[PDB]
Structure 1
Amino acid sequence: IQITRGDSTITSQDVANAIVAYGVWPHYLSSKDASAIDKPSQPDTSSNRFYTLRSVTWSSSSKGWWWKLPDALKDMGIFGENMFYHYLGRSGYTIHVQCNASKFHQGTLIVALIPEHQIASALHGNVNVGYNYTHPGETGREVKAETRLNPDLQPTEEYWLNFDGTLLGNITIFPHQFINLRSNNSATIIAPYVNAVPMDSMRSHNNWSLVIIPICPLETSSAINTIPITISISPMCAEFSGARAKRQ
């Protein structure tokens, strides 16, 4: 089947065998939890549609990829603008990861959505991760062997340590889904807003972090020996506050 949401519509979503992060469905901020007493209203279905990032290439040597939300969507039409022209904001998402392969391809991905995924820096000593590298945008972050710049600002490349000192394989404690090519070829996660406060500065704080690690290497005898992984994200109950003048 196909999930048409807004002016966007993604085919191949099918049935609803997706995971709902922590069992809580994305909801609008209730007045009881609200920060400034209550706001008259915040109903806007304008930012609620599907933004499909460029498909990443999964090769026989791919070690992993990760994106951070809301960061990844900072440049996605309405949502992007909204979060740029507002001081505070909160949002849930419906991440949809799917890859095209055949019955002659084999491989497995772990698609996990990690809350407050605080990355660890690459080097030893008194170093820390720099702003630019945890905010790669929709491009995401690919695990590479090549040497990079402001090295002491760079985050770790140890994917098997979840990029934060924990063991991959325990990463299943977070809302996730496995993508076993011979069984399924897509996964879906519906996550609500998660933070210790009602809303926040989307610019400085990334609530969720989408991680994708190939637990079982991709193998195939096809001419081109790589397949694409397509990611579609859709904001859920997005709300904003402290709007500022735009086009100024």
Structure 2
Amino acid sequence: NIVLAYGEWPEYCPDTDATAKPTRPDVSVNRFYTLDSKMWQENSTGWYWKFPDVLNKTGVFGQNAQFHYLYRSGFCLHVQCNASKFHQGALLVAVIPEFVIAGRGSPHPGFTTTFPGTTGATFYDPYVLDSGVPLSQALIYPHQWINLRTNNCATVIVPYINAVPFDSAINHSNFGLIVIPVSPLKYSSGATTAIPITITIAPLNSEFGGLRQ
């Protein structure tokens, strides 16, 4: 049913120094944030979303992660696409920690290419994941297939993976959520051309330390 990233069930920080202190916010921030639905077509090529960049400037999490210079949280990711029984295809939904966009053409990528926002950007070369690293071996990461004749939803629960127990939520993005159609979408003439893909994010154990302004 659910994929559990590295078998952890994320928790709070144990007994760290410089915190006696950090606020543990309630379900006002731990609700279900539903992003936009991306239309997956025949010539579509994939998408990626940076975390926690997709929940900056959005709701209570935007007002906390912009006015705090420490941050630690784990997420619950729920990707679901709504297709009929006459469409076909497959999606690869993986979670890549420290997902670095490379830059192409023998030339560094822009700000909106690596930090796309809520509207996550699209791949240019999904075969090499836009990082010179092949999709053929991209099943090392916590993944789940969305095959349109078997299932529609994929649930991945990601803990906090970092070498430092507290960083800033604006500069550093911990992981990325790729959704790449490995097998393309085919349909007979008359069906719906675009199939939406909706994503729901619920933060689990968010912490914030040190308040501004």
**If the length of structure 2 is used for normalisation, what is the TM-score?**
0.94
Paired with 1:39 and 1:212, the residues of 2 have a C-alpha distance of 41
2:166 maps to amino acid: M
With a CA cutoff of 8 Å and minimum separation of 6, indicate the structure with the bigger relative contact order. Answer: 2
Q: 1:88 to 1:107 in 2, by over 3 A?
A: same
Partners in 1 of 2:62 and 2:22 — Cα distance? 21
Matches of 1:169 and 1:77, distance apart in 2: 37
Change (3 A) 1:204 1:185: same
The Cα shift of 1:43 comes to 2.7
* CA distance in 1: counterparts of 2:10 and 2:104, whole angstroms: 34
Q: For residues 90-101 of structure 1, what are the structure 2 equivalents within 5 Å?
A: 90-101=72-83
For residues 41 and 242 of structure 1, do their structure 2 counterparts lie closer, same or farther at Cα, with a shift above 3 Å needed?
A: closer
Q: What RMSD in Å do the two structures reach over aligned CA positions?
A: 1.3
Matched, 1:113 2:95: yes
Note if contact 1:219-1:225 (Cα within 8 Å) is conserved in structure 2.
no
Q: Which residue of 2 aligns with 1:234?
A: 202
Deviations along 1:200-244, one digit per CA (max 9) or x if unpaired, are 111111101000100111112243222100011111201111111
Please name the residue that 2:24 is paired with.
Answer: 43
* Dislocated runs of 4+, deviation >4 Å: none
- Aligned residue in 2 for 1:140: 120
Q: Is there any run of 5+ residues in structure 2 with no aligned partner, and where?
A: none
CA-to-aligned-CA distance 1:151-175 (integer Å, 9 cap, x gap):
xxxxxx2211012111102110001
1:1-248 matched pairs, under 5 angstroms:
17-31=1-15, 34-36=16-18, 38-40=19-21, 42-45=23-26, 46-124=28-106, 127-143=107-123, 157-221=124-188, 222-245=190-213
TM-score (norm 1): 0.81
Matched residues, number: 211
Render the CA deviation track for 1:32-58: whole Å, top value 9, x for unaligned. Answer: xx242x444633223111110110000
Q: Does the 8 A contact of 1:107 with 1:219 survive in 2?
A: yes
CA shift, 1:94, in A, is 0.4
C-alpha distance in structure 1 between counterparts of 2:152 and 2:47, whole Å: 17
Aligned to 1:11: none
Q: 1:109 and 1:179 mapped to 2: Cα distance?
A: 5
Identity %: 49
SS at match of 1:230: strand
Aligned equivalents of 1:208, 1:202: Cα separation in 2: 12
Residue of structure 2 equivalent to 1:4: none
1:161/1:168 contact within 8 Å kept: yes
User: Aligned partners of 1:134, 1:167: CA distance in 2, in Å?
Assistant: 19
